Design a protein around this ligand. Structure first.
Ligand SMILES: CC1=C(/C=C/C(C)=C\C=C\C(C)=C\C(=O)O)C(C)(C)CCC1
Ligand SMILES: CC1=C(/C=C/C(C)=C\C=C\C(C)=C\C(=O)O)C(C)(C)CCC1
Lengths: 212, 217
């Protein structure tokens, strides 16, 4: 009904050429994803092979959710975990303005235009993490159960805090479709970079693109 | 097995539909646009994703140009003496000749556009020819070319199986479809030459990923 502060705890523990910088910030946080998920109620009690499968599945959406929320503070830019700011002016000149602008309007803006609080960002991340449809899962039913628990606990949280908005929870969940979509597109750009010879051979991101 | 279960043509048609939207500058900008979508296109072709990432990239670096030419050629069946770019523009041969690329342009119109228009190639067929062009087991660098060859064979089977079921009174449609491959291969090599040439004479298209594909692996 409410392991919520454990989830916020997880989020606070992990965290502080334009493409090259974004990818290096990504490498940095991809690693912390291990410590982040381990601090998530019940995640550690799942078979090792399942924990790895869940992270290989949502790692990109998970990282995009995090830096997007961190960026609510600025405008027309994003704040990397390496302490750098990247302006959309730079995204465009480098060739990625389209997906960049999609991140700014469908994620950064929607979270700033409703004041998303870290505890909700942490919960959406946990819902993204507990995707029972991931291929290869030992017990997809237990994972599904865990997702449901984040749903319950999260809705329960929106009530205790924002009762004068008998909908908020539904508004939070509206970010999921965009994240899923933006996330798939980023994997494409990543493949693309390797396709055209400007592959970032110095990160671990490209290993995450391999087929399971 | 069943030819079509090992390589379903509805999945292949699906791939194609997901990606369907100075003359030279315009053609090159349409090319950049679709070069990118090639990533999403190939990811939807049955089994392409199950290959080692390095192989997927090698297959695309090898046939990207033939793959794009096949697509805009088919799209152009709709007009006469011109081609329809993915950016929504139409380019007439007259402008192509004024620019000095009327020779290859006419080759595309007669050896590809016309042949497809006349035999009424359908999107599923165009998609299968593209998949055959993609699974090229002779691409240098391949880690397991035997698996790629196997996949090509599956598209062949599945595609022949499709012509026989859909056009039962055209026994030689499959062989006729495959006749487009040699022209595509040939037209495709010539376009790489023109692309190099543009850079050679100082008319290199500014900021396009097109030029990046010309680098040697
Ligand atoms: C949005 C985006 C991209 C994808 C990024 C991914 C998958 C993760 C970034 C994580 C960071 C930057 C984390 C941190 O600083 O918290 C690419 C490379 C295609 C370039 C264009 C913009
Ligand atoms: C045929 C042709 C050329 C090559 C084009 C290539 C390699 C790709 C085009 C893709 C498009 C135009 C895609 C789309 O709109 O679907 C060049 C530049 C030598 C100019 C003369 C005519």
């Amino acid at each position: 009904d409410m392991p919520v502060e454990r989830i916020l705890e997880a989020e606070l523990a992990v965290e502080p050429d334009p493409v090259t910088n974004i990818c290096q910030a990504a490498d940095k946080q991809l690693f912390t994803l291990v410590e982040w998920a381990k601090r998530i109620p019940h995640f550690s009690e799942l078979p090792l092979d399942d924990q790895v499968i869940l992270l290989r599945a949502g790692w990109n959406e998970l990282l995009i959710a995090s830096f997007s929320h961190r960026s609510i503070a600025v405008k027309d830019g994003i704040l990397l975990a390496t302490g750098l700011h990247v302006h959309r002016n730079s995204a465009h000149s480098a060739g990625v303005g389209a997906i960049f602008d999609r991140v700014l309007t469908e994620l950064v803006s929607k979270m700033r235009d409703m004041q998303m609080d870290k505890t909700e960002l942490g919960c959406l991340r946990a819902i993204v993490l507990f995707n029972p449809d991931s291929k290869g899962l030992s017990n997809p039913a237990e994972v599904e159960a865990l997702r449901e628990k984040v749903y319950a606990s999260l809705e329960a949280y929106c009530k205790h805090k924002y009762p004068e908005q008998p909908g908020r929870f539904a508004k939070l969940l509206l970010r999921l479709p965009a994240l899923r979509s933006i996330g798939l597109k980023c994997l494409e750009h990543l493949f693309f970079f390797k396709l055209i010879g400007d592959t970032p051979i110095d990160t671990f991101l490209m290993e995450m693109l391999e087929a399971p």
